[PDB]
Amino acid sequence: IVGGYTCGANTVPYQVSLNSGYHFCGGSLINSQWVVSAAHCYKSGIQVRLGEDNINVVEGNEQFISASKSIVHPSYNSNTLNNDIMLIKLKSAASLNSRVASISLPTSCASAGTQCLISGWGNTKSSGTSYPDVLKCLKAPILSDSSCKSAYPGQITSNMFCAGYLEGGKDSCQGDSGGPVVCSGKLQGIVSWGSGCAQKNKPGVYTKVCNYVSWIKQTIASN
């Protein structure tokens, strides 16, 4: 997260860190056994780390649970990043409490202008490289689909939306991938892609979660 703020320990209780010996992606806990992340975060040997603030220090609220299965969206295209969504099942159910909690799935899509909270442990610099240890947060509006398409000609599908600031300076970034965009208490987006980070006229692009709620529910129901 570039141009954001320190969230505060466990203030984003659905935020997960995906760990394969090190943090490599974010994710969102959607019930006691399932995490939503980006398909581009797919790899084997994932351990899901819940209740994290400082990802380099055991602080007392963590639950570390290995993934038992990963399900990349059937239509994920790694070249276009269309359908950039994946489900991860935990080997055991998380113990849900104030600091480890699921986030509600949307029942309808969000509109341009809605404010959202984007969070993660990704790069904090738009030019250089600095990775934070504690969770960073950014409040950002959803942008109109027309401005999104204008920013990224030929690249925005109906499964994507832009959020952030066309002036630059405030954005998600590398390492935030797979993490949440939460708007009015619903998971509306997943950190997917962008051109650099926090660059002028290049806002963050996010997976449009409301399109996938049907697939998420039925997948969970049979797995």
- Min dist. Cβ of residue 203 to ligand H06 (A): 7
Per CB under 6 A, 84 contacts ligand H06: no
Say how far apart CA 43 and CA 171 lie, in whole Å. Answer: 25
Say how far apart CA 63 and CA 114 lie, in whole Å. Answer: 32
Does residue 68 carry a catalytic annotation? no
188 is in an annotated binding site: no
Per CB under 6 A, 17 contacts ligand H06: no
Nearer CB in complex with Ca ion: 62/145: 62
88, 148, 176, 180: which one contacts ligand H06 (CB under 6 A)?
Answer: 176
177 is in an annotated binding site: yes
Compute how many other C-beta atoms are within 10 angstroms of the C-beta atom of residue 195.
13
Does residue 53 carry a catalytic annotation? no
Compute how many other C-beta atoms are within 10 angstroms of the C-beta atom of residue 159.
21
Does residue 70 carry a catalytic annotation? no
CB 23 within 8 A of CB 175: yes
Per CB under 6 A, 155 contacts ligand H06: no
Per CB under 5 A, 47 contacts Ca ion: no
Say how far apart CA 10 and CA 55 lie, in whole Å. Answer: 12
63, 83, 172, 207: which one contacts ligand H06 (CB under 6 A)?
Answer: 172
CB 30 within 8 A of CB 187: yes
Element (H, E) at 190: strand 186-193
Nearer CB in complex with ligand H06: 94/110: 110
Binding site for ligand H06 (CB under 6 A): 171-174, 176-177, 191, 193-194, 197, 204
